[PDB]
Design an enzyme around this catalytic site. Structure first.
Site, mmCIF file in Angstrom:
data_model
loop_
_atom_site.group_PDB
_atom_site.id
_atom_site.type_symbol
_atom_site.label_atom_id
_atom_site.label_comp_id
_atom_site.label_asym_id
_atom_site.label_seq_id
_atom_site.Cartn_x
_atom_site.Cartn_y
_atom_site.Cartn_z
ATOM 1 C CD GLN A 1 -2.648 1.270 2.279
ATOM 2 O OE1 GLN A 1 -2.467 1.018 3.580
ATOM 3 N NE2 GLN A 1 -4.050 1.383 2.205
ATOM 4 C CD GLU B 1 -7.973 2.865 4.100
ATOM 5 O OE1 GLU B 1 -6.700 2.715 3.677
ATOM 6 O OE2 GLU B 1 -8.929 2.280 3.939
ATOM 7 C CB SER C 1 6.691 12.144 -3.583
ATOM 8 O OG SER C 1 6.009 11.230 -4.396
ATOM 9 C CG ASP D 1 6.483 6.737 -3.632
ATOM 10 O OD1 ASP D 1 6.726 7.600 -4.728
ATOM 11 O OD2 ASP D 1 7.587 6.576 -2.954
ATOM 12 C CG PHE E 1 10.208 9.338 -11.603
ATOM 13 C CD1 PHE E 1 10.593 8.448 -12.652
ATOM 14 C CD2 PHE E 1 9.388 10.612 -11.774
ATOM 15 C CE1 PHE E 1 10.418 9.165 -13.860
ATOM 16 C CE2 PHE E 1 9.399 11.195 -13.093
ATOM 17 C CZ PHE E 1 9.973 10.463 -14.067
ATOM 18 C CG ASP F 1 -1.793 1.976 -4.975
ATOM 19 O OD1 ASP F 1 -2.056 2.958 -4.457
ATOM 20 O OD2 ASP F 1 -1.986 1.400 -5.764
ATOM 21 C CG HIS G 1 -8.533 -3.186 -2.344
ATOM 22 N ND1 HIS G 1 -9.106 -2.285 -3.169
ATOM 23 C CD2 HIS G 1 -7.708 -2.207 -1.710
ATOM 24 C CE1 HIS G 1 -8.915 -1.134 -2.932
ATOM 25 N NE2 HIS G 1 -7.926 -0.907 -2.230
ATOM 26 C CB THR H 1 6.271 12.263 -8.685
ATOM 27 O OG1 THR H 1 6.522 11.665 -7.645
ATOM 28 C CG2 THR H 1 6.266 13.606 -8.451
ATOM 29 C CG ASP I 1 9.430 10.315 -6.365
ATOM 30 O OD1 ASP I 1 8.558 9.840 -5.764
ATOM 31 O OD2 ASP I 1 9.664 11.485 -7.105
HETATM 32 C C1 HEM Z 1 -8.846 0.731 3.862
HETATM 33 C C2 HEM Z 1 -7.840 0.501 2.486
HETATM 34 C C3 HEM Z 1 -6.681 -0.418 2.775
HETATM 35 C C4 HEM Z 1 -6.417 -1.090 4.000
HETATM 36 C C5 HEM Z 1 -7.220 -2.113 4.184
HETATM 37 C C6 HEM Z 1 -6.124 -0.649 1.448
HETATM 38 C C7 HEM Z 1 -5.056 -1.174 1.151
HETATM 39 C C8 HEM Z 1 -4.471 -1.330 -0.175
HETATM 40 C C9 HEM Z 1 -3.054 -2.173 -0.459
HETATM 41 C C10 HEM Z 1 -2.528 -3.102 0.484
HETATM 42 C C11 HEM Z 1 -2.893 -2.035 -1.853
HETATM 43 C C12 HEM Z 1 -1.671 -2.542 -2.683
HETATM 44 C C13 HEM Z 1 -1.173 -3.763 -2.646
HETATM 45 C C14 HEM Z 1 -3.701 -0.914 -2.432
HETATM 46 C C15 HEM Z 1 -3.723 -0.473 -3.664
HETATM 47 C C16 HEM Z 1 -4.826 0.516 -3.964
HETATM 48 N N1 HEM Z 1 -5.892 1.029 -3.394
HETATM 49 FE FE1 HEM Z 1 -6.516 0.350 -1.553
HETATM 50 N N2 HEM Z 1 -6.865 0.183 0.642
HETATM 51 C C17 HEM Z 1 -7.893 1.022 1.320
HETATM 52 C C18 HEM Z 1 -9.107 1.758 0.700
HETATM 53 C C19 HEM Z 1 -9.122 2.322 -0.395
HETATM 54 C C20 HEM Z 1 -9.862 3.387 -1.000
HETATM 55 C C21 HEM Z 1 -11.346 3.955 -0.427
HETATM 56 C C22 HEM Z 1 -9.465 3.427 -2.242
HETATM 57 C C23 HEM Z 1 -10.286 4.137 -3.471
HETATM 58 C C24 HEM Z 1 -10.994 3.284 -4.367
HETATM 59 C C25 HEM Z 1 -11.426 4.160 -5.521
HETATM 60 O O1 HEM Z 1 -11.395 3.419 -6.606
HETATM 61 O O2 HEM Z 1 -12.407 5.078 -5.391
HETATM 62 C C26 HEM Z 1 -8.256 2.861 -2.658
HETATM 63 C C27 HEM Z 1 -7.664 2.599 -3.659
HETATM 64 C C28 HEM Z 1 -6.394 1.863 -4.070
HETATM 65 C C29 HEM Z 1 -5.763 2.073 -5.312
HETATM 66 C C30 HEM Z 1 -6.259 3.072 -6.552
HETATM 67 C C31 HEM Z 1 -5.133 4.326 -6.586
HETATM 68 C C32 HEM Z 1 -5.598 5.021 -7.641
HETATM 69 O O3 HEM Z 1 -5.388 4.618 -9.017
HETATM 70 O O4 HEM Z 1 -6.305 5.971 -7.512
HETATM 71 C C33 HEM Z 1 -4.571 1.066 -5.233
HETATM 72 C C34 HEM Z 1 -3.621 0.789 -6.310
HETATM 73 N N3 HEM Z 1 -8.117 2.073 -1.543
HETATM 74 N N4 HEM Z 1 -4.654 -0.613 -1.427
HETATM 75 CA CA LIG Z 2 6.530 9.444 -6.502
#
Ligand code: HEM
Ligand SMILES: [Ca+2]
Ligand code: HEM
Ligand SMILES: *[C@@H]1O[C@H](CO)[C@@H](O[C@@H]2O[C@H](CO)[C@@H](O[C@H]3O[C@H](CO)[C@@H](O)[C@H](O)[C@@H]3O)[C@H](O)[C@H]2NC(C)=O)[C@H](O)[C@H]1NC(C)=O
Ligand SMILES: *[C@@H]1O[C@H](CO)[C@@H](O[C@@H]2O[C@H](CO)[C@@H](O[C@H]3O[C@H](CO)[C@@H](O)[C@H](O)[C@@H]3O)[C@H](O)[C@H]2NC(C)=O)[C@H](O)[C@H]1NC(C)=O
Ligand SMILES: *[C@@H]1O[C@H](CO)[C@@H](O[C@@H]2O[C@H](CO)[C@@H](O)[C@H](O)[C@H]2NC(C)=O)[C@H](O)[C@H]1NC(C)=O
Ligand SMILES: *[C@@H]1O[C@H](CO)[C@@H](O[C@@H]2O[C@H](CO)[C@@H](O)[C@H](O)[C@H]2NC(C)=O)[C@H](O)[C@H]1NC(C)=O
Ligand SMILES: *[C@@H]1O[C@H](CO)[C@@H](O[C@@H]2O[C@H](CO)[C@@H](O)[C@H](O)[C@H]2NC(C)=O)[C@H](O)[C@H]1NC(C)=O
Ligand SMILES: *[C@@H]1O[C@H](CO)[C@@H](O[C@@H]2O[C@H](CO)[C@@H](O)[C@H](O)[C@H]2NC(C)=O)[C@H](O)[C@H]1NC(C)=O
Ligand SMILES: *[C@@H]1O[C@H](CO)[C@@H](O)[C@H](O)[C@H]1NC(C)=O
Ligand SMILES: *[C@@H]1O[C@H](CO)[C@@H](O)[C@H](O)[C@H]1NC(C)=O
Ligand SMILES: [Ca+2]
Lengths: 595, 595
Positions: free
Chosen positions: B105, B258, B190, B110, B186, B108, B351, B184, B188
């Protein structure tokens, strides 16, 4: 050439041909040019359109542009600096019943209506305008000047949209813009019967084979009827008093409910239809429904033209009628019966005659009850005050006994209309009719005061000492152009009303000209004008000259004592007479003998 | 496709061009093309946008158009039928610490943030979507199927606002719609230093030389740092528990708080920096407050990158890492470093790695307290349980000793996330991450499932016997299309997440592709990637080759027993050793010496 840009939706009718009856759409009144004068066609232009890009954007749009080298004053400022007034003391016309301005708004309504553009019936662009005040597309916001009280209360502006134009309304182009008139240019009571066949039948009791108008089955008035409640839910007449839950009335026209007094006369006209149909039926038993419906519709229209041209226009144009509406002399097949764009801005003078309160009188015309005298402002889109509060009898009395407001150069529009206006689309009671009337001028592209003073043959003042000569008043002449900077830029609505009134009339030189002409034309160019040979017979006419609005009252309400001249100032004991002193409209000539 | 596009609001800057330091905005990384990989640009596209009107309405919003001839399943309906389960037993990944889940998470966050849209600022429109569930331009509801629990209990639907797009924010036209990445691209770090010039600064303690990030002045953790609280009134953190009244933490990235577990590692990071800056200062007495940040900030990013490619990716991809991520052969400037849209849905595989509960352990890694195991759902946006109930020490022992959730074709997403998800915007605790995800694909214009199997060059199943051979599960393949009716319409997220796992990895053949390709790319196109020459010295690298997440834990907490391999399963106390047993990252090579 004919770079006749783009076309039209339009109900396409084929006329009948010989029929002695008017079409709903308005077509065929003219044999050489059918659609000439029908509903849903662009308003006519007596003078070339004047837009900023010369083609379609309003003056006051791209700030960083002027007209004639000046910045057009904000709409709302023109209102405050010049239109408003605080003290209602003795600001009432004294030889004019309230009926004098109600019949006005009615004839206006039979003649024109430029639909606002709202695509959007789920929509949030509808909201980018009410909530962010951002100019772009059909949203053309009315900004506020500094220290405008509204600022601390309603927002940064007043939502406002552009009037639909010919062809679509969406992503707009090509030639100089012309907005639509969704009603018919003829005094044909199309406010009582409608302008699109689709709706003209909805209005009809078509289960009884005796030609009648559809009426309310859930509300009554002493065994007398009200128009049918309108269908569509998110109606505003409900919003006003959430508890009461009584919607708007539905009539041939869609503005019928704006204000309780308008709705009232819509009820008399609706009512007169039935007395007439029933009557005719009894006299001409063999007559069939459809036949009844239209012989009635014809009787009624003749009515709106006689009251309007005999009792109403004399006292508006006053001593300038003989000059503009010469005595009738037959169908002039070649006269534009269409309504010009300007007309719809020149007939708005009435806006300046609306009083700040509407009162209800009890059988002896005495102010009845603890709340007989209400604020104009709490009456827009108000029907519950009718259904659930004495019916319309006590309102009709008000119109007969109380007087209208008089146009005063320094008391133009009451605040009830210039500060607390209700728009059916919105929730607040804080819009401004004066400001709207002003940008709406610009939206339509009207030319200026001078270019119109010209169209009529009056001097086009340029010097501030010159404006004074015309307006006959310095401080008005001054406040005016500390704003416009030159006579050539003053908005027609305001510039026109600013003039003092002609002798024995209620509008000045320029308004008399613009109305006079318009009216003559819909009278000389209407193939069904009652007096024109053929539309009615010698004996039917004879009977028609005896109608009167006073009589209209006597036959459809429980009022008993009424004035001979419903349009002038009348006190209660003396000027009133029991109905039996007034003519009756003998429908005998309508009798049809078999063999 | 080499062509033009909407150049909307972006912080503009001048590339110094010889600064050994990354900019904060992400700009200037790429010499020939600056913006590339910058924040607030909108997401690389690897395939055509698929929308219902070929431009912007989500598939499944117009209640009558289809996709390939079939109706698209309600977002929520898929969740009830497929994604959920009621026993949380045996669902644990025997060989993966809860930390695994957590580092995913961080990596992701970053890389990608698509802002959902509007606010309003005193709006009547947030109200029209969370009350009447009416579809409309910014509000795309998630409807509740028939016979669904939430119906009796929450309502008709749950709020859902489409995500931000690139020219506008507000309403309009012409090209296939794309969403914005506000972070960003990369790797990095951020999520720590921020993505905005202005925030980037405020996040630091400039009231000193020492070049440090600003810490919280109201609360400490056993003589240790915490991030500073966030100003924002109508804070979600306080709403949880009004009695405690503890605000959200302010970090380099919005989502920082969160969940207790994320906000936790967010501090270890923050602490890591202050250490380095401090540390560097004594080895380099004459450096600058400013030189301190970004010499450290450099040290830190490099840390993220390593842990991510070295202990983390090798176990997500498994036997598909060599196939997609070959060994670094140096900066390939001709490579697009931007995050694709699909990546943002491919990465959500995590997720399904979130276990039902979150634990707290006592220094002997024994459940510490009367309420050690807390149901997850009461932890979204929780801060007091940290600042007020214990510190982060108990939590970090949690991550190292507990296990993640194994993806299991039968138990997809915890009910603490499917039914009880908390959103910062609103009040109740009853949303659905799964349904958000599916809805969110259609919003982002995600091509169907097959259109991706093909893109990665894999069998495209058309029949039910087809979809079974791939999923290796009959019943599932059936539930799936008894709903989608065709493999072509399966939403990527689920369809991807449906395929059975690859060897020694944690994702299916499809995701393996998407994720492999993306990661390789941000590594081969990042001019500042550490292994790259010039970025860090030969010696400097040799010392970075030993950073470990276990050491991080050590230098920045009061934990003395930690495992060598913080990512897999580790039972206390056999797999735990003394912090003195693990390496230290010698910063001696960062020692600059005068002449
Ligand atoms: C609570 C939430 C988490 C903890 C239980 C959780 C966890 C993760 C992990 C471990 C990820 C990667 C291995 C991961 C990736 C992405 N998430 Fe998720 N997340 C929780 C709650 C949310 C909510 C709300 C969102 C927004 C969903 C939407 O589509 O509106 C969310 C998103 C994402 C996401 C999208 C990034 C993007 O493109 O904007 C991941 C790559 N999480 N999460
Ligand atoms: Ca970055
Ligand atoms: C409330 C309103 C009235 C009563 C207090 C009122 C009254 C009149 C009279 C007496 C008129 C002529 C004799 C007359 C003409 C026209 N009006 Fe006006 N009106 C009230 C409220 C409104 C509102 C709102 C509008 C719409 C304004 C806009 O342009 O957006 C309005 C309009 C008009 C109008 C335009 C017809 C058209 O071209 O569509 C008149 C000719 N009124 N009114
Ligand atoms: C909402 O519309 C209601 C109509 O359905 C209206 O209610 C009625 O108004 C008053 C309440 O104050 C009562 O009517 C009496 O008022 C005067 C005395 O002040 C009398 O002279 C009248 O003859 C009349 O009988 C009614 O009891 C009442 N009816 C109901 C159902 O409430 C409300 O006034 C409207 N409310 C608002 C805020 O507009
Ligand atoms: C709201 O947040 C509160 C924390 O800010 C939390 O209260 C905390 O829990 C109890 C008070 O109910 C106290 O903990 C225990 O204290 C002694 C043990 O030392 C016991 O004997 C008590 O019975 C109690 O269990 C904490 O001191 C208290 N914290 C504070 C700051 O007051 C509430 O539980 C939270 N409420 C909800 C609904 O989540
Ligand atoms: C009030 O208005 C009425 C209506 O016009 C005036 O009476 C008319 O007077 C003109 C001549 O000025 C005649 O043509 C009509 O015989 C009158 N018509 C009606 C209906 O009476 C009346 O003079 C005005 N009152 C005052 C005090 O000026
Ligand atoms: C259509 O016309 C018929 C005919 O009058 C109306 O029916 C009468 O309604 C009145 C009052 O509502 C009753 O007293 C009579 O008993 C009815 N007459 C008959 C012959 O049934 C009917 O209400 C009208 N409907 C509409 C919508 O206008
Ligand atoms: C838990 O998972 C990891 C990675 O999948 C396993 O690591 C491999 O373990 C096997 C020993 O069975 C060897 O192939 C390699 O030496 C290990 N590689 C790594 C990076 O650890 C780990 O050992 C698994 N648990 C067990 C007991 O194997
Ligand atoms: C910003 O950095 C300064 C520099 O160290 C911090 O100041 C010291 O803070 C410690 C810890 O609270 C105190 O014991 C010292 O007395 C402070 N020294 C000086 C010279 O101020 C300061 O606390 C930091 N502030 C923030 C918000 O991070
Ligand atoms: C109608 O037009 C005719 C034709 O030119 C002409 O006699 C006259 O000007 C008009 N007649 C009337 C009554 O207006
Ligand atoms: C660099 O990237 C380009 C563009 O994708 C590609 O041709 C090649 O794989 C890379 N070049 C080398 C030498 O690896
Ligand atoms: Ca008409």
């Amino acid at each position: 050439s004919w770079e006749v840009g783009c076309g039209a939706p339009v109900p396409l009718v084929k006329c009948d041909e010989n029929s002695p009856y008017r079409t709903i759409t308005g077509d065929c009144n003219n044999r050489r040019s059918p659609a000439l004068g029908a509903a849903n066609r662009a308003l006519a232009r007596w003078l070339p359109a004047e837009y900023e890009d010369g083609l379609a954007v309003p003056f006051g749009w791209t700030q960083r542009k002027t007209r004639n080298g000046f910045r057009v004053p904000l709409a709302r400022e023109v209102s405050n600096k010049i239109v408003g007034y605080l003290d209602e003391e003795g600001v009432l016309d004294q030889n004019r019943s309230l009926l004098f301005m109600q019949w006005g708004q009615i004839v206006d309504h039979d003649l024109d209506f430029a639909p606002e553009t709202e695509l959007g019936s789920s929509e949030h662009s509808k909201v980018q305008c009410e909530e962010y005040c951002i100019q772009g597309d059909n949203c053309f916001p009315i900004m506020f000047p500094k220290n405008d009280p509204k600022l601390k209360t309603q927002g940064k502006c007043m939502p406002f949209f552009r009037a639909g134009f010919v062809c679509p309304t969406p992503p707009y182009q090509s030639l100089a813009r012309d907005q639509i008139n969704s009603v018919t240019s003829f005094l044909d009571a199309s406010l009582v019967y409608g302008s699109e066949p689709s709706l003209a039948s909805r209005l009809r009791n078509l289960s009884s084979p005796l030609g009648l108008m559809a009426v309310n089955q859930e509300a009554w008035d002493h065994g007398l009827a009200y128009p049918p409640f309108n269908n569509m839910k998110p109606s505003p007449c409900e919003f006003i008093n959430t508890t009461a839950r009584v919607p708007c009335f539905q009539a041939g026209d869609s503005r019928a409910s704006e204000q309780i007094l308008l709705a009232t006369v819509h009820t008399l006209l609706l009512r007169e239809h039935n007395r007439l149909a029933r009557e005719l039926k009894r006299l001409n038993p063999h007559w069939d429904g459809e036949k009844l419906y239209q012989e009635a519709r014809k009787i009624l229209g003749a009515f709106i033209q006689i009251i309007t041209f005999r009792d109403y226009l004399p006292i508006v144009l006053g001593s300038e009628m003989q000059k503009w509406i010469p005595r009738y002399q037959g169908y002039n097949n070649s006269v534009d019966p269409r309504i010009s764009n300007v007309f719809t801005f020149a007939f708005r003078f009435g806006h300046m005659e609306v009083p700040s309160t509407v009162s209800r009188l009890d059988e002896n015309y005495q102010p009845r009850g603890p709340e007989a005298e209400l604020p104009l402002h709490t009456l827009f889109f108000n029907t519950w005050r009718i259904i659930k509060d004495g019916g319309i009898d006590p309102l009709v009395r008000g119109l007969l006994a109380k007087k209208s407001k008089l146009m005063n150069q320094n008391k133009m529009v009451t605040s009830e209309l210039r500060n607390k206006l209700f728009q059916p689309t919105h929730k607040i009671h804080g819009f401004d009719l004066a400001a709207i009337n002003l940008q709406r001028c610009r939206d339509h592209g009207m030319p200026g005061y001078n270019s119109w003073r010209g169209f009529c043959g009056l001097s086009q003042p340029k010097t501030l000492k010159g404006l004074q000569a015309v307006l006959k008043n310095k401080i008005l002449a001054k406040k005016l152009l500390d704003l416009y900077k030159t006579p050539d830029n003053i908005d027609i609505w305001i510039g026109g009303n600013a003039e003092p009134m002609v002798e024995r009339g209620r509008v000045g030189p320029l308004l008399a000209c613009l109305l006079g002409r318009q009216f003559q034309q819909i009278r000389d160019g209407d193939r069904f004008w009652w007096e024109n040979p053929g539309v009615f017979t010698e004996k039917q006419r004879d009977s028609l000259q005896k109608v009167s609005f006073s009589r209209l009252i006597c036959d459809n309400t429980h009022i008993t004592k009424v004035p001979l001249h419903a349009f002038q100032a009348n006190n209660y004991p003396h000027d009133f007479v029991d109905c039996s002193a007034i003519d009756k409209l003998d429908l005998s000539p309508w009798a049809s003998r078999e063999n």
